[PDB]
Amino acid sequence: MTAAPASPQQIRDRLLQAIDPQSNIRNMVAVLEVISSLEKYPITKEALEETRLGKLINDVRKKTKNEELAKRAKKLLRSWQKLIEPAHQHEA
């Protein structure tokens, strides 16, 4: 459900209904909606800390759709990581 979540807080709610708070998967199919959404909507930096999506980075790293993709994802994640390390080359 929901083709466009837009705001990061709503993504968190969708994550927790797919997995246990202890970061283990109950429904991979439900997880796929979260990652597929994140592929269309990258989490903003102030929202990343606000909604605490950094834990999602930990879980998606191991439970991502494609293990090879997790290596590629770093390019996208760097747009978020700019809050700890200067990364704002062209997405300004």
UniProtKB/Swiss-Prot annotation:
Chain's role: Component of the Mediator complex, a coactivator involved in the regulated transcription of nearly all RNA polymerase II-dependent genes. Mediator functions as a bridge to convey information from gene-specific regulatory proteins to the basal RNA polymerase II transcription machinery. Mediator is recruited to promoters by direct interactions with regulatory proteins and serves as a scaffold for the assembly of a functional pre-initiation complex with RNA polymerase II and the general transcription factors.
Q: Which organism is it from?
A: Homo sapiens
Localization annotation: Nucleus
Cite the record's note on assembly: Component of the Mediator complex, which is composed of MED1, MED4, MED6, MED7, MED8, MED9, MED10, MED11, MED12, MED13, MED13L, MED14, MED15, MED16, MED17, MED18, MED19, MED20, MED21, MED22, MED23, MED24, MED25, MED26, MED27, MED29, MED30, MED31, CCNC, CDK8 and CDC2L6/CDK11. The MED12, MED13, CCNC and CDK8 subunits form a distinct module termed the CDK8 module. Mediator containing the CDK8 module is less active than Mediator lacking this module in supporting transcriptional activation.
- What is the superkingdom listed in this entry's lineage? Eukaryota
The portion of the full protein included here is 1 to 92 of 600
**What is the recorded name of this protein?**
Mediator of RNA polymerase II transcription subunit 26
- What region holds the TFIIS N-terminal domain? 10-87
The entry's family comment says: Belongs to the Mediator complex subunit 26 family.
